[PDB]
Amino acid sequence: IFAEDV
Amino acid sequence: IFAEDV
Amino acid sequence: IFAEDV
Amino acid sequence: IFAEDV
Amino acid sequence: IFAEDV
Amino acid sequence: IFAEDV
Amino acid sequence: IFAEDV
Amino acid sequence: IFAEDV
Secondary structure, three states, X not given: OEEXXX | XXXXXX | XXXXXX | OEEXXX | OEEXXX | XXXXXX | XXXXXX | XXXXXX
């Protein structure tokens, strides 16, 4: 699982 | 920026 | 698990 | 900056 | 700029 | 997985 | 895993 | 600049 917020 | 790999 | 906050 | 590898 | 390779 | 933000 | 912030 | 290789 890979989650990214900028 | 917050990025998490599980 | 790798979590990064900038 | 806070980065943690488990 | 933020680039991540998993 | 490769994610890039400029 | 390689993550880079400039 | 913060770069981390795991």
